[PDB]
């Protein structure tokens, strides 16, 4: 057999120019898109201010329009999903990740407008969903769209253009290219059988988008924790501990998200209007909390910097944790178009921080700075729920810039999966596919 | 479908027995990577309490500054030709092959051979890295336990082998993230799904990095300091630089390859026509390492100096070529030592120069050569060894200039994008193929 390999080696890294060139067109498109989405989202969360402030005198009139808006939109969201693209609803990565193994279609001529405008409402309203996930999906479709519009055929160019579309997407989302790759090839990628995804193809894609994103988002990051202190080897074990905690709570949060999404099915049975109505319901709810305690609502990003600094008191932390631990489930589990990738970071950050403060006072001789713990854990609730450590560790670094904490960040995320494993749980992203894959059949 | 649905629900489940072993492995690799690195220096040191002792009589210097690097270089080749022919050279082509099960892991041989062996080639002053050598010393370590504990099952043979490499690659550059991205972008059997447990590797990598930090704390291997940044209007410049690496990438490959043939004739396969040719190039190096060190040795030390802009356009090109030579002549000579590390130096040096040119070319981009000296520190990896992602990240891992990530990629990418469209192949795979085909028949 060694006769073949010897020929396969000498025939490596040869990816058709036609493919590479397309991954470029794709990567590019994804970017422009990821941008406009992100742009549109804000623009609305904005209007929802030139609303409140206009009626900032009559308190009940506020709390009122601070519900209606996030309700009218959230609904509009669910609608554009239940009536045009049931596949959109929820993250959207379980699908792309499945569509890779060829177990789900990529109805882009549907999903795109649906997921786009759709989440524009859910997110542009104030719900507890990220916009990253939604993009990963919006991305792949973009890849597909070209694949179809140029009918270049051949597995390679169907799994490749699909994968890069994702990566490009994930990247332009956090302005993090390295993550967008490590991701596709640690998670999305068909987990059990060699595949025709051209790594290099992805890169060009990722890049092309990050550039596109930098074209409209330069001079400002999404987070800016600033160089935190360092971490001595005698304080390493502390990050392991924090890791283990994430490890036990990782699968749990997974049960909830999962089951909770069932217990939320009863309320509407599958009825477009029992949903849309329940939609603007949680939606409006959020928009309200987003003007009575915003750290419980919205993306959650904005409170990461504040959290890492140590501006939240042990009290305000725990409160914010729980509150979100709830708004998050109730929003994602409700099949609304939006993801739980981003908001998971927030929880991570917040949980980590707290662990820090405890540590700080526990041993003042380690000269700790909660901020570091608020980082060893920013992506740990990713290394337990979504079990994609390597993608997290790197996504964090990618946008937190504290490589000095690489040793801790790993020892945590590792310890994370090391307990998210030894205690049930599974890739919250895989489980979703499986279910939505088994429910596909087992129903005929 | 039904299968998949059961496969998903059965993911990330790696036997506690495996994980626990990857740990013992990782650990061992570290302590090892350390003592190696420690010993190497110790020698490059003695070769000072030698020269200085005879720093009065010039020719007496240039003399003992050859004999030492000769006596050792030989001792190296010897412990290889007579005890482990598989060691000689990098050592990665093997491990990478041993993964697909096309080469054996004669650890009870390789370990002492490669170790003490390269301790001489390197500890003398040859143009070979110590990284590669360790990747190999690593896998074996992984093997050794596999055997000593006869835990059987592909998974625990491909896993403990892989992590052993990673752990090794890591403790080498104190770069964990690299040690992983590497195994799963290169070493990994390139064409068929495998039973290597990612998580298994991590625990391994970590365990070694910790082990390395235990004895190497408070000091990095490189310290370029936060360089400036890079505006989107100076991006294309890094593409250009990338394309240059992309054309010279395969070329340097031809040479390394062929040159290792043209170096075969001199000894035919004779243990003594080698050993003699060994301390020949060996002694040569040790000499240059006291008449122009930037042409000899690991080459690390001159990366910082290079990135700063301390070398003039003259001294750069000279240092490039000189090394472009000493490197081939040393690695291609099947001496136990790798070309991973020294390839960085070339990259850095080539990059820098490109910088200075740029700087004066357009002073309106307010460039700083230093950044180009980095978009390319690992670009001659993204062409020779065609492992961009592992490079990009190994650089960052120990350069700390994430602000340059956009450039660093656009180069390395542009690198393989030409190393491709112009012949060339994974200098690491080609070696295996050859050393695999030269096997059957």
């Amino acid at each position: 057999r060694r006769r073949q390999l010897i020929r396969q080696l000498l025939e490596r890294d040869k990816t058709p120019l036609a493919i590479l060139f397309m991954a470029a067109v794709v990567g590019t498109l994804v970017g422009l898109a990821a941008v406009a989405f992100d742009k549109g989202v804000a623009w609305l969360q904005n209007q929802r201010m030139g609303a409140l402030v206009h009626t900032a005198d009559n308190y009940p009139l506020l709390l009122t329009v601070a519900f209606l808006c996030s309700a009218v939109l959230a609904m509009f969201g669910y609608f554009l999903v239940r009536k045009y693209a049931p596949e959109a609803g929820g993250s959207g990565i379980p699908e792309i990740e499945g569509a890779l193994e060829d177990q789900r279609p990529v109805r882009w001529w549907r999903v795109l407008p649906v997921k786009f405008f759709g989440g524009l409402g859910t997110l542009g309203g104030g719900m507890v969903l990220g916009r990253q996930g939604p993009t990963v999906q919006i991305g792949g479709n973009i890849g597909r769209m070209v694949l179809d519009i140029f009918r270049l055929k051949g597995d390679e160019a169907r799994h490749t253009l699909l994968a890069t579309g994702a990566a490009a997407g994930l990247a332009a989302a956090f302005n993090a290219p390295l993550a967008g790759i490590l991701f596709i090839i640690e998670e999305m990628r068909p987990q059990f059988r060699y595949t025709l995804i051209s790594i290099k193809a992805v890169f060009i894609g990722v890049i092309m988008s990050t550039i596109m994103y930098r074209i409209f988002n330069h001079e400002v990051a999404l987070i800016d924790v600033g160089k935190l202190s360092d971490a001595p080897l005698n304080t390493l074990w502390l990050y392991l501990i924090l890791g283990i905690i994430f490890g036990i709570f990782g699968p749990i949060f997974n049960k909830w998200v999962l089951g909770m999404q069932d217990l939320l099915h009863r309320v509407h049975g599958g009825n477009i209007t029992k949903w849309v109505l329940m939609g603007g319901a949680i939606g409006g709810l959020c928009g309200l909390l987003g003007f009575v305690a915003p750290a419980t609502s919205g993306g959650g990003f904005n409170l990461i910097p504040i959290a890492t600094a140590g501006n939240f008191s042990m009290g305000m932390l725990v409160f914010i944790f729980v509150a979100r631990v709830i708004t998050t489930l109730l929003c994602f589990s409700s099949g609304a178009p939006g993801g739980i990738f981003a908001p998971m970071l927030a929880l991570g950050t917040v949980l980590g921080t707290a662990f820090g403060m405890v540590a700080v006072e526990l041993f003042p001789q380690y000269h700790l700075e909660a901020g570091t713990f608020a980082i060893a854990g920013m992506g740990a609730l990713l290394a337990a729920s979504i079990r994609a450590p390597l993608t997290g560790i790197i996504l964090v670094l990618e946008m937190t810039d504290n490589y000095q904490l690489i040793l801790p960040m790993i020892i945590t995320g590792l310890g994370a999966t090391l307990l998210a494993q030894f205690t049930g749980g599974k890739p919250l992203y895989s489980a979703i596919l499986a279910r939505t894959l088994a429910k596909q059949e087992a129903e005929q | 479908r039904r299968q998949l649905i059961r496969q998903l629900l059965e993911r990330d489940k790696t036997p506690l027995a495996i994980l626990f072993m990857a740990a013992v492995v990782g650990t061992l690799v570290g302590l090892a990577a350390v003592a190696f690195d420690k010993g190497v220096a110790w020698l490059q040191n003695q070769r000072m309490g030698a020269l200085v002792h005879t720093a009065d009589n010039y020719p007496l210097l240039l003399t003992v500054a050859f004999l030492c690097s000769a006596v050792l270089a030989m001792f190296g080749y010897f412990l290889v030709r007579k005890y482990a022919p598989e060691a000689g050279g990098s050592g990665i082509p093997e491990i990478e092959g041993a993964l697909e099960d096309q080469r054996p892991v004669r650890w009870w041989r390789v370990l002492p051979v490669k170790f003490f062996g390269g301790l001489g080639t390197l500890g003398g002053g040859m143009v070979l890295g110590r990284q590669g050598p360790t990747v190999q010393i690593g896998g074996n370590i992984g093997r050794m336990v596999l055997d000593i504990f006869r835990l059987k099952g592909d998974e625990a043979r491909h896993t403990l082998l892989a992590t052993g490499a990673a752990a090794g690659l890591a403790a080498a550059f104190n770069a964990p993230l690299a040690g992983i991205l590497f195994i799963i972008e290169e070493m990994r059997p390139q064409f068929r799904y495998t039973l290597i447990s990612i998580k298994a590797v991590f625990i391994g990598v970590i365990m070694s990095t910790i082990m390395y930090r235990i004895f190497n704390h408070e000091v990095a291997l490189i310290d370029v300091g936060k360089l400036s940044d890079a505006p989107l209007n100076t991006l294309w410049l890094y593409l250009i630089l990338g394309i240059i690496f992309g054309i010279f990438g395969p070329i340097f490959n031809k040479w390394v390859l062929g040159m290792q043939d043209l170096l075969h004739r001199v000894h035919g396969g004779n243990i003594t026509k080698w050993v003699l040719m060994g301390g020949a190039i060996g002694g040569l190096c040790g000499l240059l390492g006291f008449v122009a060190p930037a042409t000899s040795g690991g080459g690390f030390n001159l990366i910082p100096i290079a990135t700063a802009g301390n070398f003039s356009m003259g001294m750069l090109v000279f240092i490039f070529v000189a090394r472009v030579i000493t490197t081939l002549l040393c690695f291609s000579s099947g001496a136990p030592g790798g070309i991973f590390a020294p390839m960085l130096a070339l990259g850095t040096v080539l990059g820098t120069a490109f910088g200075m040119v740029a700087v004066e070319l357009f002073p309106q981009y307010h460039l700083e050569a230093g950044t180009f000296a980095i978009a390319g520190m690992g670009a001659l990896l993204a062409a020779s060894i065609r492992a961009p992602l592992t490079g990009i990240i190994l650089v960052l891992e120990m350069t700390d200039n994430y602000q340059l990530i956009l450039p660093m990629i656009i180069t390395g990418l542009g690198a393989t994008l030409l190393a491709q469209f112009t012949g060339g192949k994974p200098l690491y795979s080609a070696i295996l193929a050859r050393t695999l085909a030269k096997q059957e028949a």
Partner: antibody
Amino acid sequence: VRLLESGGGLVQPGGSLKLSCAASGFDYSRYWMSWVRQAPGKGLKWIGEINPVSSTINYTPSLKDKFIISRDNAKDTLYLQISKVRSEDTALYYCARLYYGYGYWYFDVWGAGTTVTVSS
Amino acid sequence: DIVLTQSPAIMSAAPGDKVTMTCSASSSVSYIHWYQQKSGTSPKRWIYDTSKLTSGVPVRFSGSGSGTSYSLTINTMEAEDAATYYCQQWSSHPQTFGGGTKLEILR
């Protein structure tokens, strides 16, 4: 972010004056500092620019050492030495902080000013 | 070195009016900048990269142009816009400023 430059004043033809510019409210390093002068009534004319590590320093088309820009990052201060001054050198001297958008650098935060009058 | 020459040397218009000032380059430039200088103050970075208002610039202001000729505009100018605007380029070393345009308000 305050850019306060002192030094200016009265100097007799063929003289020399060391204009100073103390920075505060930001990281002096990572920053390219420059000077630009405005002649009473007239417009602005770029003098020089000196990168962080001061490993680069350029000036407008003006001879040998009419100008000598330097900086002591240890004191976050920018300097400017004008020698053999002449009436054409009487103007308002500003020290700006340099940055860029897409990359075609701009004069970010201009300091106060300091005036140099050449006269006997 | 590039010779930027701002068209109206001096101009006056009554607030709420639409005013536009030009800035031509002898050769070719790209991503021009604009600085606003009110009496008694050092210049202030107004518009940049041809049309990126700076953090704080009223959305009243707008940048434009291309290669050989650029401009800066004020849709409905207000009285607090009285000042001297300076276009500057650095798309070709050494950088160069314009002759300036002095806006004056009619009341």
